[PDB]
Every structure is written in structure tokens, then in C-alpha cells.
């Protein structure tokens, strides 16, 4: 019914990739006008491909690059659209999906890099950002959410230390202030890689090690252990932050000392004995035994 | 002995229509005992294509699927191998082996299936398997302007897996034969 049209727009979405680049833009605005008399709640289905359309269509424009002067005029105009088309969708009372879409976008800008695609990634990047803050409230959506937008914003390379930073100072808040202390301490620990393979423009197109700060960044992980007063939940939480510790570890990031992994190990081991035999509590043991193993030391 | 689907981020109809022609063409009812998809297919219209191949079929659920009712990700024992599913986007960076590793590590299984990349990967690390299927219908992924149409069905006689892959190169199906076997 609501959802009709989807395989409708299969089709059309198809075929229009075969027409020449200037002429998609115009058959795709008609497409968007058509659907949007559609309805709010038909658009949800019938506007999300015209969006990945743009995107792809973008990079059509690219893929001409010698043979058109303006193609990075274009471009901007086709994510002038995309954005025009999923804001419509906001309208339309929806959140998620548009989260999503505009990380998609953000990570097109970034890729196609025509004239000012910074400043677009950057404003679909807070656009993201905004939808998280005021219309996502579920505790399971939020840890989602904010994943889904701290592993975008770690493959992107075209932000400006100016940028990057701010970018990557929301991504911390909004990971330590998730509902709950469980995926408060999976989401600030997940920050780290942003501090480290992160990459700005700036270090002409290194990453940024910052060792010190992916280890403050764990810190605040652990801290945040500490609390979750649960014999079950507690420890595994030790047992994650440990492999990630690792994970730094073993790519060289100086700071993680193995001293501090043998403070985190032990410190496991004084708490994995106090469970009660459960489907889970010896799933909890095999993962730390698989952690010990890896490290050799079993 | 039994052999398995694993194939994902078909992305219909965000940004394909369907699965190639010629892919279309192999998979067909009967020859299927098993099916592990990683990706978002999107659709239940693809859902129940998927419920054709075969009748036990296992899905996670991928950055972009509507049903919110699938699994974030599920463990499925298939004979002698204990496998995982997870489509991706939450191993962060998207498709850091020792992220992967990490995670195999967690789950506590012989092999790993995830997509989220559109790259095909069949690969072995500290004794352990890791197969990434790519996008079976070769659909758009921004870091990747050259993304290649594939799937992949692994066959198990007993503690001994043979995964064949099936890319889409040029008109004609090339394939690739890779094996792996419990430590």
C-alpha cells in the first residue's frame, strides 16, 4: 500500500543511471516533485532512493571531469537536492532514516571533493548530529545512532582541523551521555579510534595518533566500569575496554603500557570467579580466556 | 555435508533494482540447505526471494534494513563450525581486520561473516576464518567507486570448509576456490 511505489522506484532509479548526467538532475527533480505530492507517509519509501541517486549521480558528474568545466557546480546543486529531499522526510515526522542519509551524504561530499564539498559534509555532518539530539530519545536507537555516526565520521579525511575537532569532541559528549552505563562505556571507549586513525587535512593526510588521547578516552571507559554495579555486566565491560586497550596496543600507540593491560587483566580475574553458572557466565569466561589466549599468556 | 549461502548488502531498492541477470541464473531452489545474509536487503520483498533459495534462513540486521526486528547480530552452528553475523557498521573502522578479530574473539566462533564494505574478503588470522560475501548486487558504497556484483556459498563436509566466490567481471561469472579447515 504506503510501500507500493518501492518497486515502482527500483525500476526508475535503474534506467535513470543510463541517461546522460545532464539529464538526470532534470528527470530526477521531476521524479522528487511526482513523489512528493505523494503523501508523508509514502515518501519515506519513494524519497530515500532518489537521495542515493543524487549521491551516485554525483560522482557521475566527477567521472566527466575533464569533459565539463562545471561539473563541480553541478554537484553542489545535486546536494543542494539531496539535502532539500531529505529534510523533506524530517518533515514527515522521521528521524532515523534521515540520520542516516545525511551520514551517507556527508561521506559522498567528502569522497567527491568538487568545490566547497567540505562545507557541505561538514553542515550534513551537524545535520546528522541535530536529528540525534532532538528526535532520538530511545536508549537502543541512541547507541545505534551515535556508532553509526562516530564509524562515519572515522573513514572521512577531508575535514579541516577546525572541523575535526569540534566533530570530535561532540562524538565524546554524546557517547559518555547515552541513558544507560553500559553503552555509555561502549561508546566512549569506541571514541578512541577517532583520536587515533582519525585523519584531518592537516597532517597531510595522516592519521592523527594521538596515543594520549585515546588513552584518556579508555580512562573514561573504565571509570565508567566502575559504576555499572552489576557482578555480570560489570566485567564484561572490563573484559571489551581490555580488548580495545589491545587494539591500540598492538598498533603501536606507545602510551597503552603492557603494565596498564596487567592492571586491567588482573583486576578480571579478581571478579569473573563470582558468577553464577549461566549460558552467559561461561561465554564471559571463553572471551576472556580467548582475550588471555591471544596475548599468549594462556 | 552441507553447503550454505552467504550473500548481503543488496540494498534493494535504495540503490539496485535486483540481483544480476546471471546471478539470478545460479541460485536457484533446492541445491541451498543454508542461507547467512549480512547486508541490509532492505525489502522484505527480498526477504522472501532469499525464503525461496532455501527455508532456513538467518539474518542480521544492516544499517539501512526497515525491520528493526532483525538480530544486531546471531551465532548459527552449521555442523562442525560455529559462525557469526554481524553486517558491519559497527565494527569500527568498517573493515579493520583486528577490529573483525577482536570481535571473533567475543563471539567465540570458528569463522566470521560480515559485509558493510562491498568487498569481497576470504581471508584466515590466528587460526580463525573471516568471509565478507560483498554486495550481490555490486550496489553503490561512497568509499568505493568500483564496486564488483558477488555472493558466495561455502561448502562444509566436516571440519573443512570450501568457500567458493562468485564475482561479476565483465559479462562472464569469474570464480574463485578457497579452503579452510578447523586448527
Request: hydrophobic letters at 40%; charged letters at 25%; aromatic letters at 10%.
Amino acid at each position: 500500500d504506503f510501500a507500493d511505489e518501492q518497486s515502482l522506484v527500483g525500476r526508475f532509479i535503474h534506467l535513470l543511471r543510463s541517461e546522460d548526467p545532464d539529464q538526470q538532475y532534470l528527470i530526477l527533480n521531476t521524479a522528487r516533485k511526482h513523489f512528493g505530492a505523494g503523501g508523508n507517509q509514502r515518501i519515506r519509501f519513494t524519497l530515500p532512493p532518489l537521495v542515493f541517486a543524487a549521491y551516485q549521480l554525483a560522482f557521475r558528474y566527477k567521472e566527466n571531469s575533464k569533459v565539463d568545466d562545471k561539473w563541480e557546480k553541478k554537484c553542489q546543486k545535486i546536494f543542494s537536492f539531496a539535502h532539500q529531499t531529505i529534510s523533506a522526510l524530517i518533515k514527515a515526522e522521521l528521524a532515523e532514516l534521515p540520520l542516516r542519509l545525511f551520514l551517507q551524504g556527508a561521506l559522498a561530499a567528502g569522497e567527491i571533493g568538487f568545490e566547497n564539498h567540505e562545507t557541505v559534509a561538514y553542515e550534513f555532518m551537524s545535520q546528522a548530529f541535530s536529528l540525534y539530539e532532538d528526535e532520538i530519545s530511545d536508549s537502543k536507537a541512541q547507541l545505534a545512532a551515535i556508532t553509526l555516526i562516530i564509524g562515519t565520521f572515522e573513514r572521512m579525511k577531508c575535514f579541516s582541523e577546525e572541523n575535526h575537532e569540534p566533530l570530535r569532541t561532540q562524538c565524546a559528549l554524546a557517547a559518555s551521555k547515552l541513558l544507560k552505563k553500559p553503552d555509555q562505556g561502549r561508546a566512549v571507549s569506541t571514541c578512541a579510534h577517532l583520536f587515533w586513525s582519525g585523519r584531518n587535512t592537516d597532517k597531510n593526510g595522516e592519521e592523527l595518533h594521538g596515543g594520549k588521547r585515546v588513552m584518556e578516552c579508555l580512562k573514561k571507559a573504565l571509570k565508567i566500569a566502575n559504576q555499572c554495579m552489576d557482578p555480570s555486566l560489570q566485567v564484561q565491560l572490563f573484559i571489551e575496554i581490555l580488548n580495545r586497550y589491545i587494539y591500540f596496543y598492538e598498533k603501536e600507540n606507545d602510551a597503552v603500557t603492557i603494565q596498564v593491560l596487567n592492571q586491567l587483566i588482573q583486576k578480571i580475574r579478581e571478579d569473573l570467579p563470582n558468577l553464577e553458572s549461566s549460558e552467559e557466565t561461561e561465554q564471559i569466561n571463553k572471551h576472556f580466556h580467548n582475550t588471555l589466549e591471544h596475548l599468549r599468556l594462556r | 555435508m552441507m553447503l550454505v549461502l552467504v550473500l548481503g548488502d543488496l540494498h534493494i531498492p535504495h540503490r539496485c533494482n535486483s540481483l544480476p541477470a546471471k546471478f539470478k541464473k545460479l541460485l536457484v531452489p533446492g541445491k541451498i540447505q543454508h542461507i547467512l545474509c549480512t547486508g541490509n536487503l532492505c525489502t522484505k520483498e527480498s526477504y522472501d526471494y532469499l525464503k525461496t533459495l532455501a527455508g532456513d534462513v538467518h539474518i542480521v540486521r544492516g544499517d539501512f534494513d526497515e525491520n528493526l526486528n532483525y538480530p544486531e547480530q546471531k551465532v548459527v552452528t552449521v555442523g562442525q563450525f560455529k559462525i557469526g553475523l554481524i553486517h558491519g557498521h559497527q565494527v569500527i573502522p568498517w573493515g579493520d581486520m583486528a577490529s573483525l578479530a577482536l570481535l571473533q574473539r567475543q563471539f567465540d566462533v570458528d569463522i566470521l561473516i560480515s559485509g558493510h564494505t562491498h568487498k569481497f574478503e576470504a581471508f584466515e588470522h590466528e587460526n580463525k576464518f573471516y568471509i565478507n560475501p560483498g554486495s550481490a548486487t555490486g550496489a553503490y558504497n561512497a568509499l568505493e567507486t568500483n564496486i564488483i556484483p558477488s555472493f558466495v556459498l561455502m561448502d562444509i563436509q566436516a571440519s573443512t570448509v570450501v568457500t567458493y566466490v562468485y564475482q561479476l567481471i565483465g559479462d562472464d561469472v569469474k570464480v574463485e576456490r578457497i579452503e579452510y579447515k578447523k586448527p
